[PDB]
Amino acid sequence: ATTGEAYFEQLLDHHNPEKGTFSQRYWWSTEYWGGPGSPVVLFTPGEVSADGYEGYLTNETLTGVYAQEIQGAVILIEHRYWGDSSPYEVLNAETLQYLTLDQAILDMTYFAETVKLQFDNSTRSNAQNAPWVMVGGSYSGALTAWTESVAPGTFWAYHATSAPVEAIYDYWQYFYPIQQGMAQNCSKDVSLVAEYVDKIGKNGTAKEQQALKELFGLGAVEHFDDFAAVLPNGPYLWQDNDFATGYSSFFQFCDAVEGVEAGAAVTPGPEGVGLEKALANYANWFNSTILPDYCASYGYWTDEWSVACFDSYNASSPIYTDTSVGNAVDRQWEWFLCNEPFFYWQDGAPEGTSTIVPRLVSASYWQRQCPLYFPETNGYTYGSAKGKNAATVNSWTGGWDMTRNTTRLIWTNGQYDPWRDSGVSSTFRPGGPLASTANEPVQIIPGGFHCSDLYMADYYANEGVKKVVDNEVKQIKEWVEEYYA
Ligand SMILES: *[C@@H]1O[C@H](CO)[C@@H](O[C@@H]2O[C@H](CO)[C@@H](OC3O[C@H](CO[C@H]4O[C@H](CO[C@H]5O[C@H](CO)[C@@H](O)[C@H](O)[C@@H]5O)[C@@H](O)[C@H](O[C@H]5O[C@H](CO)[C@@H](O)[C@H](O)[C@@H]5O[C@H]5O[C@H](CO)[C@@H](O)[C@H](O)[C@@H]5O)[C@@H]4O)[C@@H](O)[C@H](O[C@H]4O[C@H](CO)[C@@H](O)[C@H](O)[C@@H]4O[C@H]4O[C@H](CO)[C@@H](O)[C@H](O)[C@@H]4O[C@H]4O[C@H](CO)[C@@H](O)[C@H](O)[C@@H]4O)[C@@H]3O)[C@H](O)[C@H]2NC(C)=O)[C@H](O)[C@H]1NC(C)=O
Ligand SMILES: *[C@@H]1O[C@H](CO)[C@@H](O[C@H]2O[C@H](CO)[C@@H](O[C@H]3O[C@H](CO)[C@@H](O)[C@H](O)[C@@H]3O)[C@H](O)[C@H]2NC(C)=O)[C@H](O)[C@H]1NC(C)=O
Ligand SMILES: *[C@@H]1O[C@H](CO)[C@@H](O[C@H]2O[C@H](CO)[C@@H](O)[C@H](O)[C@H]2NC(C)=O)[C@H](O)[C@H]1NC(C)=O
Ligand SMILES: *[C@@H]1O[C@H](CO)[C@@H](O[C@H]2O[C@H](CO)[C@@H](O)[C@H](O)[C@H]2NC(C)=O)[C@H](O)[C@H]1NC(C)=O
Ligand SMILES: *[C@@H]1O[C@H](CO)[C@@H](O)[C@H](O)[C@H]1NC(C)=O
Ligand SMILES: *[C@@H]1O[C@H](CO)[C@@H](O)[C@H](O)[C@H]1NC(C)=O
Ligand SMILES: *[C@@H]1O[C@H](CO)[C@@H](O)[C@H](O)[C@H]1NC(C)=O
């Protein structure tokens, strides 16, 4: 009773049943369940082992809150090819061929119709006889949206928060919301430094380049674009923020760039400190607070001051060659990027557009790594090597244009979510950010980050988030009640 774990026999290839099944881990809770015929909330963590995600079964998360508000069960399902839910122990271009969006979608619908639940083994709790609500954020949010688009008729309702539904090759706009959200002074100074790094990369002497690398403690990094590629570590911490993280790693970064200590009486205004100070501060912040134990955290290395993990040009690096399901880099997600292909390459902005990341960090810098991760094996290669591209995925899914004709799907996006401009509220989406309708609601959380509505800590910290949560819960509750009308 109440909680449990089990294995579901998921179809390897939904288009060829006869190729067989594999074991896929899921967890359940009936804590708020009303009994046979009551609703069910389904959620996958997405691109990660499900270990330590048990919280999504409780009302400390939005999934548990939905369940509580509609008297439903809650099921956490581990995504295929992660954790204990991989059909193969070795992951290369051949074995990864069944890690595709299409498969992942049909997993969800097939599971909802097919699973034999321990808590109700009469089919009264399956999707045929009870309203299932699929919820997700980030990639899992996209999978949720993509399912409503590609495979409607199983789930009663869908909620996708921070969903990158549009595949984008040169996703320089990853950084644009960070640039909008950051302090004026930090934004300006980080920009200065990023542009200076471009300048030295292109038009500097060998000594100037060696010296610049020394400032960051990266004298030993061979390729100048590998060095440039570490600078985004600053802006990347924006993605770790929510409304309950306070003076987080990100805000420490900005303070370091501006050159002040936490709680300083005297701070610079919006003008900032300028290049000379900013560069010094940025380099020292990285050298002293980020570099130590950075490579060691991958497990493949152990020296505190190692720079081995920064080498994107070494084809033998364990980052590329570790084919195991438990690999440290999440090559499973890299597969989706190179194969589907999503790409989502996080780049410096085009000439003529202000950037907070060096232009030397380019789409090409990332695309070069795909064949290192996935060398041709038995004639099998990554999709984008056979000229599959962004348009390939978008034609089929609809991308951010799947919004034309939707049924009981609600969206949430964050004002300053790095993933915003790959989703329906992108400032760069043709027709503009998607206009909310009663049929297809979209809310943008003011000052929001990535999936800021999933954590109930954010509900209590922030009025904006509470507002948004109340609305979307009420919307799911109204839609769910309609099922029984
Ligand atoms: C120019 O450059 C400046 C330098 O970089 C730059 O400055 C800083 O700006 C950033 C951006 O806002 C500041 O960020 C944050 O800081 C907030 C915390 O502040 C206090 O604490 C820090 C750190 O110190 C302490 O803690 C450490 C250990 O953790 C100790 O070692 C230490 O002893 C301290 O206790 C400190 O730096 C701050 O200091 C200043 O402000 C105090 C007043 O509070 C002054 O006394 C002091 O002199 C400092 O100020 C001076 O600078 C300001 C300008 O910033 C001048 O006006 C002033 O005259 C002085 O010169 C504070 O002591 C932190 O809460 C912020 O985070 C919140 O928001 C983010 C973003 O949304 C959320 O992700 C996060 O979860 C958190 O959210 C919550 O609060 C929101 C309300 O803002 C709310 O919407 C949200 O829901 C959530 O709230 C709820 O939770 C709260 C608890 O977390 C709760 O209170 C609330 O009720 C809700 O429950 C953010 O991290 C950064 O601190 C500044 N750094 C400085 C000044 O040193 C400046 O902005 C740039 N300017 C321009 C124009 O570009
Ligand atoms: C920026 O990054 C550098 C590495 O790229 C850091 O360095 C060095 O770090 C330590 C600390 O100085 C040196 O080590 C020694 O530490 C022990 C401490 O007891 C000594 O007993 C012994 O002499 C060690 O050799 C490293 O050797 C040195 N590494 C390299 C490759 O130079 C540097 O500290 C860092 N700068 C900042 C400000 O953090
Ligand atoms: C979140 O869920 C918990 C656990 O179900 C809720 O907790 C408790 O509150 C119930 C309703 O008031 C009580 O009847 C239970 O005795 C109590 N359970 C436990 C284990 O402490 C909690 O209220 C929910 N949070 C909100 C804001 O509704
Ligand atoms: C490229 O990566 C490989 C694999 O990690 C590096 O390999 C090796 O070098 C280490 C550093 O001395 C040795 O300690 C390892 O035993 C060794 N491992 C293997 C599998 O060869 C290699 O040095 C890297 N090459 C460059 C030029 O950096
Ligand atoms: C369903 O569960 C009940 C629980 O007691 C069990 O007795 C019954 O045999 C189960 N039926 C089937 C068909 O598995
Ligand atoms: C480097 O030099 C070229 C040619 O003078 C110039 O047009 C360009 O702006 C410089 N590039 C960078 C990145 O600063
Ligand atoms: C929208 O889709 C529904 C369900 O597939 C369909 O029945 C309806 O006719 C469509 N409407 C439009 C305007 O395309």
Side-chain angles (χ1 to χ4, degrees), residues 213-220 283-289 291-292 303-307:
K213 296 191 308 182
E214 302 274 6
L215 287 191
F216 289 68
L218 302 172
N284 179 265
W285 162 83
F286 181 85
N287 195 159
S288 73
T289 83
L291 182 54
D303 173 24
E304 201 192 340
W305 301 110
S306 180
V307 297

PDB file of all heavy atoms in Angstrom, residues 213-220 283-289 291-292 303-307, ligand 2:
ATOM      1  N   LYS A 213      45.393  32.887 -21.173  1.00  0.00           N
ATOM      2  CA  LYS A 213      45.140  31.560 -20.626  1.00  0.00           C
ATOM      3  C   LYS A 213      45.716  31.343 -19.222  1.00  0.00           C
ATOM      4  O   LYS A 213      45.100  30.648 -18.418  1.00  0.00           O
ATOM      5  CB  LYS A 213      45.629  30.478 -21.579  1.00  0.00           C
ATOM      6  CG  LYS A 213      44.888  30.484 -22.900  1.00  0.00           C
ATOM      7  CD  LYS A 213      45.166  29.259 -23.757  1.00  0.00           C
ATOM      8  CE  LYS A 213      46.638  28.995 -23.963  1.00  0.00           C
ATOM      9  NZ  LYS A 213      46.759  27.820 -24.844  1.00  0.00           N
ATOM     10  N   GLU A 214      46.877  31.950 -18.934  1.00  0.00           N
ATOM     11  CA  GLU A 214      47.524  31.863 -17.615  1.00  0.00           C
ATOM     12  C   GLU A 214      46.661  32.506 -16.543  1.00  0.00           C
ATOM     13  O   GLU A 214      46.548  31.972 -15.455  1.00  0.00           O
ATOM     14  CB  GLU A 214      48.903  32.536 -17.579  1.00  0.00           C
ATOM     15  CG  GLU A 214      49.934  32.010 -18.573  1.00  0.00           C
ATOM     16  CD  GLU A 214      50.706  30.826 -18.081  1.00  0.00           C
ATOM     17  OE1 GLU A 214      50.366  30.323 -16.987  1.00  0.00           O
ATOM     18  OE2 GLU A 214      51.643  30.405 -18.803  1.00  0.00           O
ATOM     19  N   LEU A 215      46.050  33.655 -16.864  1.00  0.00           N
ATOM     20  CA  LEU A 215      45.202  34.380 -15.926  1.00  0.00           C
ATOM     21  C   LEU A 215      44.121  33.501 -15.307  1.00  0.00           C
ATOM     22  O   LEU A 215      43.808  33.641 -14.124  1.00  0.00           O
ATOM     23  CB  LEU A 215      44.557  35.576 -16.599  1.00  0.00           C
ATOM     24  CG  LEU A 215      45.431  36.790 -16.924  1.00  0.00           C
ATOM     25  CD1 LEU A 215      44.510  37.934 -17.325  1.00  0.00           C
ATOM     26  CD2 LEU A 215      46.300  37.217 -15.757  1.00  0.00           C
ATOM     27  N   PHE A 216      43.569  32.586 -16.114  1.00  0.00           N
ATOM     28  CA  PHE A 216      42.516  31.646 -15.701  1.00  0.00           C
ATOM     29  C   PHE A 216      43.076  30.317 -15.128  1.00  0.00           C
ATOM     30  O   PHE A 216      42.304  29.449 -14.707  1.00  0.00           O
ATOM     31  CB  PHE A 216      41.585  31.346 -16.896  1.00  0.00           C
ATOM     32  CG  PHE A 216      40.685  32.492 -17.298  1.00  0.00           C
ATOM     33  CD1 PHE A 216      41.209  33.656 -17.856  1.00  0.00           C
ATOM     34  CD2 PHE A 216      39.307  32.395 -17.140  1.00  0.00           C
ATOM     35  CE1 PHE A 216      40.384  34.700 -18.218  1.00  0.00           C
ATOM     36  CE2 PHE A 216      38.482  33.425 -17.517  1.00  0.00           C
ATOM     37  CZ  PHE A 216      39.017  34.580 -18.059  1.00  0.00           C
ATOM     38  N   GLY A 217      44.410  30.178 -15.121  1.00  0.00           N
ATOM     39  CA  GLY A 217      45.108  28.969 -14.694  1.00  0.00           C
ATOM     40  C   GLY A 217      45.127  27.865 -15.752  1.00  0.00           C
ATOM     41  O   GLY A 217      45.434  26.703 -15.444  1.00  0.00           O
ATOM     42  N   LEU A 218      44.806  28.242 -16.997  1.00  0.00           N
ATOM     43  CA  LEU A 218      44.656  27.325 -18.124  1.00  0.00           C
ATOM     44  C   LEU A 218      45.792  27.414 -19.171  1.00  0.00           C
ATOM     45  O   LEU A 218      45.598  27.037 -20.333  1.00  0.00           O
ATOM     46  CB  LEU A 218      43.314  27.596 -18.799  1.00  0.00           C
ATOM     47  CG  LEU A 218      42.122  27.439 -17.855  1.00  0.00           C
ATOM     48  CD1 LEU A 218      40.865  27.906 -18.557  1.00  0.00           C
ATOM     49  CD2 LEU A 218      41.955  26.002 -17.360  1.00  0.00           C
ATOM     50  N   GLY A 219      46.980  27.870 -18.741  1.00  0.00           N
ATOM     51  CA  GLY A 219      48.174  27.935 -19.582  1.00  0.00           C
ATOM     52  C   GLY A 219      48.392  26.656 -20.387  1.00  0.00           C
ATOM     53  O   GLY A 219      48.760  26.710 -21.550  1.00  0.00           O
ATOM     54  N   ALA A 220      48.110  25.516 -19.747  1.00  0.00           N
ATOM     55  CA  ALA A 220      48.278  24.176 -20.298  1.00  0.00           C
ATOM     56  C   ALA A 220      47.184  23.696 -21.248  1.00  0.00           C
ATOM     57  O   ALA A 220      47.315  22.637 -21.829  1.00  0.00           O
ATOM     58  CB  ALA A 220      48.420  23.168 -19.154  1.00  0.00           C
ATOM     59  N   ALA A 283      38.922  36.071 -14.473  1.00  0.00           N
ATOM     60  CA  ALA A 283      40.004  35.089 -14.529  1.00  0.00           C
ATOM     61  C   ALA A 283      40.326  34.483 -13.160  1.00  0.00           C
ATOM     62  O   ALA A 283      40.483  33.278 -13.023  1.00  0.00           O
ATOM     63  CB  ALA A 283      41.252  35.733 -15.087  1.00  0.00           C
ATOM     64  N   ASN A 284      40.440  35.344 -12.147  1.00  0.00           N
ATOM     65  CA  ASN A 284      40.699  34.906 -10.802  1.00  0.00           C
ATOM     66  C   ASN A 284      39.552  34.079 -10.189  1.00  0.00           C
ATOM     67  O   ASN A 284      39.796  33.142  -9.450  1.00  0.00           O
ATOM     68  CB  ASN A 284      41.004  36.087  -9.897  1.00  0.00           C
ATOM     69  CG  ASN A 284      41.249  35.644  -8.481  1.00  0.00           C
ATOM     70  OD1 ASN A 284      40.335  35.650  -7.640  1.00  0.00           O
ATOM     71  ND2 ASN A 284      42.450  35.146  -8.231  1.00  0.00           N
ATOM     72  N   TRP A 285      38.307  34.456 -10.485  1.00  0.00           N
ATOM     73  CA  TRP A 285      37.132  33.725 -10.003  1.00  0.00           C
ATOM     74  C   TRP A 285      37.191  32.293 -10.546  1.00  0.00           C
ATOM     75  O   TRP A 285      37.001  31.338  -9.807  1.00  0.00           O
ATOM     76  CB  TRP A 285      35.841  34.438 -10.435  1.00  0.00           C
ATOM     77  CG  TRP A 285      34.589  33.586 -10.369  1.00  0.00           C
ATOM     78  CD1 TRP A 285      33.821  33.347  -9.273  1.00  0.00           C
ATOM     79  CD2 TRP A 285      33.992  32.837 -11.447  1.00  0.00           C
ATOM     80  NE1 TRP A 285      32.758  32.540  -9.610  1.00  0.00           N
ATOM     81  CE2 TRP A 285      32.850  32.199 -10.930  1.00  0.00           C
ATOM     82  CE3 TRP A 285      34.316  32.650 -12.787  1.00  0.00           C
ATOM     83  CZ2 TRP A 285      32.034  31.378 -11.699  1.00  0.00           C
ATOM     84  CZ3 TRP A 285      33.500  31.833 -13.562  1.00  0.00           C
ATOM     85  CH2 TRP A 285      32.368  31.212 -13.016  1.00  0.00           C
ATOM     86  N   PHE A 286      37.462  32.157 -11.849  1.00  0.00           N
ATOM     87  CA  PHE A 286      37.554  30.845 -12.454  1.00  0.00           C
ATOM     88  C   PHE A 286      38.720  30.018 -11.895  1.00  0.00           C
ATOM     89  O   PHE A 286      38.528  28.884 -11.483  1.00  0.00           O
ATOM     90  CB  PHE A 286      37.665  30.898 -13.972  1.00  0.00           C
ATOM     91  CG  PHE A 286      37.743  29.530 -14.582  1.00  0.00           C
ATOM     92  CD1 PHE A 286      36.581  28.810 -14.858  1.00  0.00           C
ATOM     93  CD2 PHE A 286      38.968  28.929 -14.801  1.00  0.00           C
ATOM     94  CE1 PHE A 286      36.648  27.533 -15.379  1.00  0.00           C
ATOM     95  CE2 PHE A 286      39.045  27.646 -15.306  1.00  0.00           C
ATOM     96  CZ  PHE A 286      37.886  26.949 -15.605  1.00  0.00           C
ATOM     97  N   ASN A 287      39.920  30.604 -11.918  1.00  0.00           N
ATOM     98  CA  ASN A 287      41.162  29.974 -11.461  1.00  0.00           C
ATOM     99  C   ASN A 287      41.040  29.457 -10.014  1.00  0.00           C
ATOM    100  O   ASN A 287      41.414  28.327  -9.720  1.00  0.00           O
ATOM    101  CB  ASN A 287      42.290  31.009 -11.600  1.00  0.00           C
ATOM    102  CG  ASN A 287      43.704  30.435 -11.505  1.00  0.00           C
ATOM    103  OD1 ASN A 287      44.634  31.091 -11.981  1.00  0.00           O
ATOM    104  ND2 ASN A 287      43.894  29.254 -10.897  1.00  0.00           N
ATOM    105  N   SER A 288      40.452  30.277  -9.137  1.00  0.00           N
ATOM    106  CA  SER A 288      40.459  30.030  -7.698  1.00  0.00           C
ATOM    107  C   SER A 288      39.236  29.296  -7.171  1.00  0.00           C
ATOM    108  O   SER A 288      39.345  28.590  -6.177  1.00  0.00           O
ATOM    109  CB  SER A 288      40.603  31.340  -6.924  1.00  0.00           C
ATOM    110  OG  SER A 288      39.376  32.056  -7.005  1.00  0.00           O
ATOM    111  N   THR A 289      38.072  29.482  -7.801  1.00  0.00           N
ATOM    112  CA  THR A 289      36.855  28.923  -7.255  1.00  0.00           C
ATOM    113  C   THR A 289      36.155  27.874  -8.120  1.00  0.00           C
ATOM    114  O   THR A 289      35.290  27.179  -7.638  1.00  0.00           O
ATOM    115  CB  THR A 289      35.849  30.022  -6.756  1.00  0.00           C
ATOM    116  OG1 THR A 289      35.068  30.538  -7.832  1.00  0.00           O
ATOM    117  CG2 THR A 289      36.559  31.171  -6.066  1.00  0.00           C
ATOM    118  N   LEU A 291      37.978  26.024 -11.218  1.00  0.00           N
ATOM    119  CA  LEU A 291      38.981  25.061 -11.645  1.00  0.00           C
ATOM    120  C   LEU A 291      39.278  23.973 -10.611  1.00  0.00           C
ATOM    121  O   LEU A 291      39.310  22.783 -10.933  1.00  0.00           O
ATOM    122  CB  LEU A 291      40.258  25.800 -12.006  1.00  0.00           C
ATOM    123  CG  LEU A 291      41.414  24.944 -12.515  1.00  0.00           C
ATOM    124  CD1 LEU A 291      40.993  24.084 -13.681  1.00  0.00           C
ATOM    125  CD2 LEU A 291      42.561  25.856 -12.919  1.00  0.00           C
ATOM    126  N   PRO A 292      39.509  24.311  -9.325  1.00  0.00           N
ATOM    127  CA  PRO A 292      39.892  23.285  -8.360  1.00  0.00           C
ATOM    128  C   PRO A 292      38.865  22.146  -8.405  1.00  0.00           C
ATOM    129  O   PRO A 292      37.695  22.418  -8.263  1.00  0.00           O
ATOM    130  CB  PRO A 292      39.879  24.015  -7.010  1.00  0.00           C
ATOM    131  CG  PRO A 292      40.001  25.482  -7.355  1.00  0.00           C
ATOM    132  CD  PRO A 292      39.338  25.635  -8.708  1.00  0.00           C
ATOM    133  N   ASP A 303      43.684  14.606 -10.197  1.00  0.00           N
ATOM    134  CA  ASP A 303      44.435  15.816  -9.858  1.00  0.00           C
ATOM    135  C   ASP A 303      43.473  17.026  -9.715  1.00  0.00           C
ATOM    136  O   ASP A 303      42.688  17.352 -10.622  1.00  0.00           O
ATOM    137  CB  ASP A 303      45.564  16.086 -10.882  1.00  0.00           C
ATOM    138  CG  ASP A 303      46.293  17.448 -10.662  1.00  0.00           C
ATOM    139  OD1 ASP A 303      46.305  18.003  -9.541  1.00  0.00           O
ATOM    140  OD2 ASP A 303      46.871  17.979 -11.639  1.00  0.00           O
ATOM    141  N   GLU A 304      43.554  17.675  -8.551  1.00  0.00           N
ATOM    142  CA  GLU A 304      42.841  18.909  -8.244  1.00  0.00           C
ATOM    143  C   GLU A 304      42.928  19.960  -9.361  1.00  0.00           C
ATOM    144  O   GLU A 304      41.919  20.600  -9.692  1.00  0.00           O
ATOM    145  CB  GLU A 304      43.410  19.505  -6.954  1.00  0.00           C
ATOM    146  CG  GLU A 304      42.480  20.479  -6.245  1.00  0.00           C
ATOM    147  CD  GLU A 304      43.171  21.274  -5.152  1.00  0.00           C
ATOM    148  OE1 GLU A 304      44.243  20.853  -4.661  1.00  0.00           O
ATOM    149  OE2 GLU A 304      42.629  22.336  -4.793  1.00  0.00           O
ATOM    150  N   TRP A 305      44.135  20.112  -9.926  1.00  0.00           N
ATOM    151  CA  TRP A 305      44.461  21.159 -10.896  1.00  0.00           C
ATOM    152  C   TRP A 305      44.559  20.669 -12.336  1.00  0.00           C
ATOM    153  O   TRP A 305      45.240  21.275 -13.155  1.00  0.00           O
ATOM    154  CB  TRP A 305      45.769  21.838 -10.498  1.00  0.00           C
ATOM    155  CG  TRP A 305      45.694  22.437  -9.145  1.00  0.00           C
ATOM    156  CD1 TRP A 305      46.333  22.003  -8.020  1.00  0.00           C
ATOM    157  CD2 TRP A 305      44.911  23.576  -8.751  1.00  0.00           C
ATOM    158  NE1 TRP A 305      46.008  22.812  -6.950  1.00  0.00           N
ATOM    159  CE2 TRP A 305      45.146  23.787  -7.375  1.00  0.00           C
ATOM    160  CE3 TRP A 305      44.066  24.452  -9.435  1.00  0.00           C
ATOM    161  CZ2 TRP A 305      44.554  24.826  -6.671  1.00  0.00           C
ATOM    162  CZ3 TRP A 305      43.479  25.485  -8.740  1.00  0.00           C
ATOM    163  CH2 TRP A 305      43.715  25.661  -7.370  1.00  0.00           C
ATOM    164  N   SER A 306      43.848  19.576 -12.622  1.00  0.00           N
ATOM    165  CA  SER A 306      43.798  18.959 -13.929  1.00  0.00           C
ATOM    166  C   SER A 306      43.022  19.818 -14.917  1.00  0.00           C
ATOM    167  O   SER A 306      42.026  20.438 -14.559  1.00  0.00           O
ATOM    168  CB  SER A 306      43.137  17.589 -13.819  1.00  0.00           C
ATOM    169  OG  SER A 306      43.075  16.942 -15.072  1.00  0.00           O
ATOM    170  N   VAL A 307      43.501  19.840 -16.163  1.00  0.00           N
ATOM    171  CA  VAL A 307      42.864  20.543 -17.255  1.00  0.00           C
ATOM    172  C   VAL A 307      42.474  19.611 -18.394  1.00  0.00           C
ATOM    173  O   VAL A 307      42.071  20.074 -19.466  1.00  0.00           O
ATOM    174  CB  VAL A 307      43.750  21.700 -17.752  1.00  0.00           C
ATOM    175  CG1 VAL A 307      43.922  22.704 -16.618  1.00  0.00           C
ATOM    176  CG2 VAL A 307      45.106  21.216 -18.230  1.00  0.00           C
TER     177      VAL A 307
HETATM  178  C1  LIG B   2      45.247  28.737 -10.757  1.00  0.00           C
HETATM  179  O1  LIG B   2      45.410  27.396 -11.214  1.00  0.00           O
HETATM  180  C2  LIG B   2      46.737  26.881 -11.033  1.00  0.00           C
HETATM  181  C3  LIG B   2      46.746  25.553 -11.752  1.00  0.00           C
HETATM  182  O2  LIG B   2      46.494  25.820 -13.124  1.00  0.00           O
HETATM  183  C4  LIG B   2      47.085  26.751  -9.544  1.00  0.00           C
HETATM  184  O3  LIG B   2      48.400  26.191  -9.271  1.00  0.00           O
HETATM  185  C5  LIG B   2      48.978  25.667  -8.593  1.00  0.00           C
HETATM  186  O4  LIG B   2      48.267  25.281  -7.401  1.00  0.00           O
HETATM  187  C6  LIG B   2      48.963  24.802  -6.226  1.00  0.00           C
HETATM  188  C7  LIG B   2      48.904  25.870  -5.135  1.00  0.00           C
HETATM  189  O5  LIG B   2      49.949  26.820  -5.335  1.00  0.00           O
HETATM  190  C8  LIG B   2      50.393  24.310  -6.491  1.00  0.00           C
HETATM  191  O6  LIG B   2      50.869  23.401  -5.461  1.00  0.00           O
HETATM  192  C9  LIG B   2      51.323  22.987  -4.636  1.00  0.00           C
HETATM  193  O7  LIG B   2      50.515  22.944  -3.436  1.00  0.00           O
HETATM  194  C10 LIG B   2      51.073  22.371  -2.235  1.00  0.00           C
HETATM  195  C11 LIG B   2      50.354  22.971  -1.025  1.00  0.00           C
HETATM  196  O8  LIG B   2      50.907  22.451   0.190  1.00  0.00           O
HETATM  197  C12 LIG B   2      52.587  22.587  -2.141  1.00  0.00           C
HETATM  198  O9  LIG B   2      53.105  21.992  -0.939  1.00  0.00           O
HETATM  199  C13 LIG B   2      53.310  22.007  -3.359  1.00  0.00           C
HETATM  200  O10 LIG B   2      54.437  22.838  -3.663  1.00  0.00           O
HETATM  201  C14 LIG B   2      52.396  21.885  -4.586  1.00  0.00           C
HETATM  202  O11 LIG B   2      53.183  21.920  -5.784  1.00  0.00           O
HETATM  203  C15 LIG B   2      50.368  23.626  -7.844  1.00  0.00           C
HETATM  204  O12 LIG B   2      51.619  22.985  -8.103  1.00  0.00           O
HETATM  205  C16 LIG B   2      50.098  24.656  -8.931  1.00  0.00           C
HETATM  206  N1  LIG B   2      49.823  23.921 -10.155  1.00  0.00           N
HETATM  207  C17 LIG B   2      50.243  24.348 -11.338  1.00  0.00           C
HETATM  208  C18 LIG B   2      49.951  23.436 -12.492  1.00  0.00           C
HETATM  209  O13 LIG B   2      50.829  25.407 -11.471  1.00  0.00           O
HETATM  210  C19 LIG B   2      46.955  28.132  -8.915  1.00  0.00           C
HETATM  211  O14 LIG B   2      46.975  28.035  -7.488  1.00  0.00           O
HETATM  212  C20 LIG B   2      45.623  28.768  -9.275  1.00  0.00           C
HETATM  213  N2  LIG B   2      45.651  30.130  -8.787  1.00  0.00           N
HETATM  214  C21 LIG B   2      44.796  30.540  -7.850  1.00  0.00           C
HETATM  215  C22 LIG B   2      44.947  31.974  -7.431  1.00  0.00           C
HETATM  216  O15 LIG B   2      43.944  29.800  -7.366  1.00  0.00           O
END
